[PDB]
Design a protein around this ligand. Structure first.
Ligand SMILES: *[C@@H]1O[C@H](CO)[C@@H](O)[C@H](O)[C@H]1NC(C)=O
Ligand SMILES: *[C@@H]1O[C@H](CO)[C@@H](O)[C@H](O)[C@H]1NC(C)=O
Ligand SMILES: *[C@@H]1O[C@H](CO)[C@@H](O)[C@H](O)[C@H]1NC(C)=O
Ligand SMILES: [Ca+2]
Lengths: 481, 49, 480
């Protein structure tokens, strides 16, 4: 077993290297930036005369004024007296120069007149701005149609992937405006167009975005936010954090940041060598289900992370110029989604690798016996669950038919099922159950407790003990041949 | 609200009338920290300090 | 082959399930809950917080009759609150009355019990607990009408009730109330003036019914207040919704076809059973599935007979909907509806259990079934001993804590309390204070002996049986 031992050692070393690379991918110097972007950027008081939070809006006019003040303040950096002070000089890397050229904030309107009011309700309910919906989306921009900020068109300039959240996917029907220089039209002209009430009865949700522009590696970071306009004024906000940078590396300190990862991928190439030889030569269509519960997914376990890294490093760095020049503004339709998908894939791969290492940490006899015990009885253990669920559903149906009229716990079938599960875990009421039916009420409870607990909770452990003892005896009889 | 409690239930308890053997007068030592405390901004009612 | 019987059983199960889902309907629970909130939770008066659920005196009961009862029985659908251009979720109980409610009382006679002669110079009146032989059948007070004259059960079309304390007969002193509030209140006030609830009264029933006019289901309401011989008041209630109007749309006509199919299936099962019992293995009751189909057949026959009886008695309800000058006696309909619901639930449970016969195909399920069937005699034999010890402990608890706990007030209550103790749902705050000695000893010995010894033995029996069955089934294979 010298070759097997060497292969196991090599696999363990490769897994350790992959785990080290995954940990390095979560390097430092980003927690502080994320905290600054989440607690200071897009979240700060408008001035020193108010105590409201960023998302503490309660009135339409107050919300509009606070949003205008926050946009005016955040579009420019601090004083930082260390330059000629041309236009909002920035000397920090903490959510300060979070402007990145011309901004693009949209405001989707709320359709009015979803349904007719009651006939007897005359001159009472005439204008009714319906909730934000995409099935009845209406193009309702400002009356003075002039410029890009006075239009209501499709999502050709929205750049949104999907929401699939509380209501529906995000709707791009709105007015996408542009921001001039900091001291040109972004310091004392936000409210100059107050004739058209932005926070009127004809708005649904305001979508805004904020970049970083304060990162050494290409300054590639932009987050988004959406504040739903309530029917009574104010705005309820929802957003996330998207702090990141490029994948630029300096050989002085970051020479091996990802150089070995390709070598780690070479290990997968080694698994490729046995990939086409362990199936078409020996054990054809045999070790696929009863033994390949983890070997099959091991080959493609790290493929997702490598593909994500390749697509995010060698495919997005070409267009990372970010040359705004007050005339260009690229959105974050794909950057945020790609970052979220890469983070999720990395977390899933890390969890899978940890599970696989714990399985490989079972080189001792006890953990190997435990792993073998639960694998030799999976079919029986799953088969017993069928009988358990059949009896459980029969009792649930009986309880629903009997007590499903006068007891709040058995009002509906799901309530009956949840009540029975709670009864299993020592949460019996028995107060209204007994009084709902003096006969056939206690009978149900007593028979349920007796049968379920004793018989089935003992069948479970009987199966487990039988398979465990069988594994122990099988390993014991192997000695002294 | 500390002052009404102290005036109602504490002072009649420490002094009393032939009751409550005290064995030493009470004290009210306090720490200052010499900084104005910032009121908690509204939100999810964070349970931190 | 068994495939045909499998198909027939699945068809029967589908028919039964669709019939039960159809008859279950919906929003009946909400109607019952709104009835309970309207008639039980509201205070008797704005100056008191005592609702009907917490009655504690005769004067409180009198206050309830003119209070929460009337304020909630006569068009309490008043949309005087902030209703949104229509009746809100709470207010959907216009609840037109079906005639007049009825009030009735049951009382005993002075001298039903004999006081000792030693105290005879100090006490003059002795009223016994309620019993048929000790009931009073004499006029009292202003003996002028039906409220002060005894009427037999036959003349009143009554029946037993089986209340909380005793089982009350159908006779008693009764009064038929009126239609309008301002005259029913006057009648009740006249009843209160000339004292109607003396020391000899033992029970009081109030009965009425409603239709709600918009969801098409009647509702029968009964309220009982019983005064024990030891002083006090014990209230109880019964709300039963009914739906006998079963021909409105095309949906409920499908249920007639389902009932016809069920009748055909029951006839087929009956004829199959009677043919197989005779020719093949007379007295074949050795097996389990042989003794399980008989139960299903009998229960289904009882259910269809009860349904036929209900359908026949439906006509007794419809002939007076525009007449509101007589008390509608709907008690039998509600009782038989409850019986039908219980029978249907039990037969559905047994039909679902019968499915275990068919899932015995592969080795795993067959092995599990064989293990389950092998550990049946041993489990019953040990359950005999387990229940002997359980009943001994329950009787000891009944004798010790039977008067001052309320969880061990009755023997069945002791059994259910012990079963809940196995679940760890004990209070133990009242057990210790009821008896400082012999109280904790009960709890400690019961917990220790019960859990450790008896649960371990129950587990061990099944474990040994499963091991033996697996070993036997492994040995019988690869040895021929
Ligand atoms: C009850 O009956 C006894 C029997 O003699 C009598 O003395 C007593 O006055 C009676 N009391 C009432 C209230 O009728
Ligand atoms: C008793 O007689 C009639 C009922 O039949 C009733 O109208 C009358 O007012 C009653 N008399 C008294 C004194 O209550
Ligand atoms: C009892 O039933 C008979 C049947 O005809 C009826 O006449 C009588 O009025 C009923 N009893 C009462 C109190 O209504
Ligand atoms: Ca049969």
């Amino acid at each position: 077993l010298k070759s097997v031992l060497r292969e196991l050692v090599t696999y363990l070393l490769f897994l350790i290297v992959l785990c080290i690379l995954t940990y390095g991918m979560m390097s430092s110097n980003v927690y502080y930036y994320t905290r600054m972007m989440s607690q200071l950027f897009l979240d700060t008081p408008v001035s020193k005369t108010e105590k409201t939070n960023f998302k503490t809006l309660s009135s339409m006019e107050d919300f509009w004024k606070f949003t205008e003040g926050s946009l005016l303040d955040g579009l420019y950096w601090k004083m930082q007296p260390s330059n000629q002070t041309e236009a909002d000089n920035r000397s920090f890397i903490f959510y300060e120069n979070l402007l990145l050229g011309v901004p693009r904030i949209r405001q989707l309107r709320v359709r009015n007149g979803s349904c007719s009011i009651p006939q007897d309700l005359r001159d009472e309910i005439k204008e009714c701005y319906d909730v934000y919906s995409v099935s009845s989306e209406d193009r309702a921009p400002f009356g003075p149609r002039n410029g890009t900020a006075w239009i209501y068109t499709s999502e050709k300039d929205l750049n949104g992937s999907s929401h699939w959240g509380i209501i529906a996917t995000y709707s791009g029907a709105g007015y996408y405006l542009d921001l001039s220089r900091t001291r040109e039209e972004t310091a004392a002209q936000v409210a100059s167009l107050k004739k058209n009430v932005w926070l009127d009865r004809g708005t649904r949700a305001t979508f805004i975005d904020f970049s970083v522009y304060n990162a050494n590696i290409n300054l590639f970071c932009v987050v988004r936010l959406l504040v739903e306009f309530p029917a009574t004024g104010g705005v309820i906000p929802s957003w996330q954090f998207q702090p990141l940078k490029l994948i630029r590396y300096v050989t002085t300190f970051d020479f091996f940041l990802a150089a070995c990862e390709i070598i780690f991928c070479f290990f997968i190439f080694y698994y490729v060598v046995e990939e086409i030889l362990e199936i078409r030569i020996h054990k054809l269509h045999y070790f696929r289900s009863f033994w390949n519960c983890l070997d099959v997914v091991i080959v493609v376990l790290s493929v997702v992370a490598i593909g994500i890294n390749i697509y995010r490093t060698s495919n997005v760095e070409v267009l990372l110029q970010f040359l705004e020049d007050q005339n260009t503004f690229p959105n974050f339709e794909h950057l945020a989604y790609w970052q979220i998908q890469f983070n999720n894939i990395a977390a899933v791969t890390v969890f899978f690798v940890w599970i696989k290492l714990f399985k490989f940490i079972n080189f001792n006899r006890t953990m190997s016996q435990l792993s073998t015990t639960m694998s030799r009885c999976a079919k029986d253990l799953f088969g017993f669950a069928i009988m358990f669920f059949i009896i459980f559903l029969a009792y649930a149906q009986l309880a629903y038919l009997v007590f499903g009229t006068q007891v709040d716990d058995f009002s509906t079938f799901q309530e009956c099922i949840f009540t029975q599960f709670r009864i299993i875990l020592g949460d019996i009421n028995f107060a209204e159950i007994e009084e709902a039916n003096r006969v056939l009420g206690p009978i149900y409870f007593t028979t349920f407790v007796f049968f379920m607990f004793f018989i089935l909770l003992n069948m479970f452990l009987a199966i487990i003990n039988d398979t465990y003892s069988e594994v122990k005896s099988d390993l014991a009889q192997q000695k002294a041949e | 609200e500390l002052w009404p409690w102290m005036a109602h239930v504490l002072l009649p308890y420490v002094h009393g009338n032939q009751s409550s053997p005290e064995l030493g007068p009470p004290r009210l030592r306090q720490v200052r920290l010499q900084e104005a405390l910032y009121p908690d901004p509204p939100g999810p009612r964070v349970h931190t300090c």
